[PDB]
């Protein structure tokens, strides 16, 4: 595909605010393509990375990292307090068809919005 | 908060097939909870394992989707291959619910974008 401005919509707990993220090129070394959203500071912005690997099995890795912006007394430079790391990896085989991969992707997309997942992630309490 | 029968909606390239999954109990050794589909064969069943750690909380989700083909001359089918998926979430002690929900829904929304669907379906980068 060709990198374009991905406009995420109605995301969040309330599902009102939106973000738009644009690409940042591809890292020549290991091929991990990167995208980010403008936030007037290069280090305080939220970033996503995606990378598919060339073989025997195909491995796809997607990382998401966003900081928390805080500005306290004692200095005029906003400081990084805490990050939010996340990563999703797929390890499909070589003879897998498109139907299975689409099934897995859609299953992940639907399951993450299920009440069990939102209860386990938002309130950080395990299932019982 | 407790685990029970959760039914995923339409699923697939055109969202045709659907899967229903039921609890398989909680493993007391490491606290991982298992969810499985009723496929009439224990060997081949779409499996989802979810766990939440304790201290810098860590959320682990693993998906295993096996597919099998009947052997040549053997009546019982043997597993052919399987697709794996791993999702890890990391948060600090001071993370708020708004941030966690925002990250969750952002990850949910990214899988519907053209970039992710093209990358996963066709295994082609940019």
């Amino acid at each position, epitope marked *: 595909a060709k990198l374009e401005t991905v*406009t*995420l*919509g*109605n*995301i969040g707990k309330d*599902g009102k605010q*939106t973000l738009v993220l644009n690409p940042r090129g591809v890292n020549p070394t290991n091929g991990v393509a990167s995208l980010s959203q403008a936030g007037a500071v290069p280090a305080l912005e939220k970033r996503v990375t995606v990378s598919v690997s060339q073989p025997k099995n195909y491995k796809v890795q997607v990382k998401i990292q966003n900081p928390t912006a805080c500005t306290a007394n004692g200095s005029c430079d906003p400081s990084v307090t805490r990050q939010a790391y996340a990563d999703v990896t797929f390890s499909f085989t070589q003879y897998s068809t498109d139907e299975e991969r689409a099934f897995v992707r*859609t299953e992940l*997309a*639907a399951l993450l*919005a299920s009440p069990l997942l939102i209860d386990a992630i938002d309130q950080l309490n395990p299932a019982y | 908060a407790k685990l029970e029968t959760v*039914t995923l*909606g*339409n699923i697939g390239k*055109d*969202g*045709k097939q*659907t899967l*229903v999954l039921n609890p398989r109990g909680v493993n007391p050794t490491n606290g991982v909870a298992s969810l499985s589909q009723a496929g009439a064969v224990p060997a081949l069943e779409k499996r989802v394992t979810v766990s939440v750690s304790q201290p810098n909380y860590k959320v682990q989700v693993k998906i295993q989707n096996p597919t099998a083909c009947t052997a040549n001359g053997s009546c019982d089918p043997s597993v052919t291959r399987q697709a794996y998926a791993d999702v890890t979430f990391s948060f600090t002690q001071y993370s708020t619910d708004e941030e966690r929900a925002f990250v969750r*829904t952002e990850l*949910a*929304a990214l899988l*519907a*974008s*053209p970039l992710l*669907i*093209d990358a996963i379906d066709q295994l082609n980068p940019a």
Partner: antibody
Amino acid sequence: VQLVESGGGLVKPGGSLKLSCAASGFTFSDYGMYWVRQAPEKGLEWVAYIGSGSGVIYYADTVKGRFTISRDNGKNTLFLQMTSLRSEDTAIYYCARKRGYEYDGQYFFEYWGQG
Amino acid sequence: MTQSPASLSASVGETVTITCRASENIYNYLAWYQRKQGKSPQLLVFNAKTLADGVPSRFSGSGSGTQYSLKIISLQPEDFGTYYCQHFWRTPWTFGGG
């Protein structure tokens, strides 16, 4: 608010023809806009879905190649191209939207429009 | 590719009257849709038994797999219209009945 207009279709067993659903008093942006067919008696069925740049190919039967769908977001207007047409296709359609992002499970609300 | 018959009738008085039905494979992903012929249709109930905003309160709804019911106790006058029902589980969908 959520004022919805409709395009003009006045051609039967013939022509290509197009229909336009335009949103107003409402951000087009990300909401998944639906479609539907009425038909005069009895039969009335669901048709294709558009939620974002992708997810385009959710077509019902007899629609797989007969119809094509696209979304313009710079003007908050829908589009629909009709390749073939038979006695099946009537001239009364409606367009509706969705709560939020896709793969959640709520559908078909607020309609309004004509054909 | 499923089916969804309603098979109900009409009435004239409005104090308390009959509820609707539907039958297909299990799991409750449906809605009800008060269609007025002059105007466009509109939503009634979300997720089987949860009514949404801008609706009179006493339009009861309940059901489970293979069984659906919308109860209209404490009915208000001049609001008969015509109702339909759909399911959103598979791709093709039905969105039909009476």
